[PDB]
Write a protein that binds this ligand. Structure first.
Ligand SMILES: COc1ncc(NS(C)(=O)=O)cc1/C=C/C1CCC(F)(F)CC1
Length: 211
């Protein structure tokens, strides 16, 4: 009844997320490869995962999942399982878009963790743009962190897909979107990763985090 049908809340919905690479010859004939992609441009509730199970994948720390979930609100917390498409230097980019009925200034933080420990963090702020009665937040074509571009190139070298999955078992990303002015948390997404078989493109499965 009040359980989410997609990644978002009544205050802020994810519209699209993609991590991609455009090869150098895309100026001649445009193409882009999506490593991972969520599009939310009716349905039953999303499935749920108990947040305690994924606590180990994420560090106990200030700004960590356990502390954040305790501060709430619980309904803003999601877990995304990605099967990444690693079958493809070029431009490596990330694009995010959100919507709301409120006019807000968002702070979006992406925390990359390896073996639970935070390795890199990217923090951006985006002001709303009023369009057709609703407010849109566009963080498009952001350059991917060089740590992740380097990690992707090493990962694609591995000779077996199961070795890629072994490495990715210890690799997570935590995305926190907060109201810049109030500091209240609007959306928190935990990401876990596997490699898709070489024949299948990227897919995802979204869960509500409950406790
Ligand atoms: C949720 O993902 C992301 N969120 C945010 C960013 N932002 S950032 C730190 O500024 O780069 C990057 C990613 C990259 C995802 C990659 C990870 C490695 C992969 F699994 F092999 C393919 C997908």
């Amino acid at each position: 009844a009040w359980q989410a049908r997609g990644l978002g809340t009544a205050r802020l919905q994810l519209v699209e997320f993609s991590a991609f690479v455009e090869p150098p010859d895309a100026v001649d004939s445009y193409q882009r490869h999506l490593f991972v992609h969520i599009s939310q441009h009716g349905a039953p509730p999303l499935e749920s995962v108990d947040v305690r199970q994924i606590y180990d994948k994420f560090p106990e720390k200030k700004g960590g999942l356990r502390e954040l979930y305790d501060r709430g609100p619980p309904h803003a917390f999601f877990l995304v399982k990605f099967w990444a498409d690693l079958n493809w230097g070029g431009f490596y980019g990330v694009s995010s878009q959100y919507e709301s009925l409120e006019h807000m200034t968002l702070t979006c933080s992406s925390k990359v963790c390896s073996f639970g420990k935070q390795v890199v963090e990217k923090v951006e702020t985006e002001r709303a743009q009023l369009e057709d009665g609703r407010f849109v937040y566009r963080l498009l074509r952001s350059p991917m962190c060089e740590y992740l571009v380097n990690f992707l190139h090493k990962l694609r070298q591995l000779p077996e897909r199961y070795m890629m999955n072994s490495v990715l078992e210890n690799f997570t990303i935590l995305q926190v979107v907060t109201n810049r002015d109030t500091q209240e948390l609007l959306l928190c997404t935990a990401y876990v990763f596997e490699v898709s078989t070489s024949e299948r493109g990227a897919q995802h499965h979204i869960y509500r985090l409950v406790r």
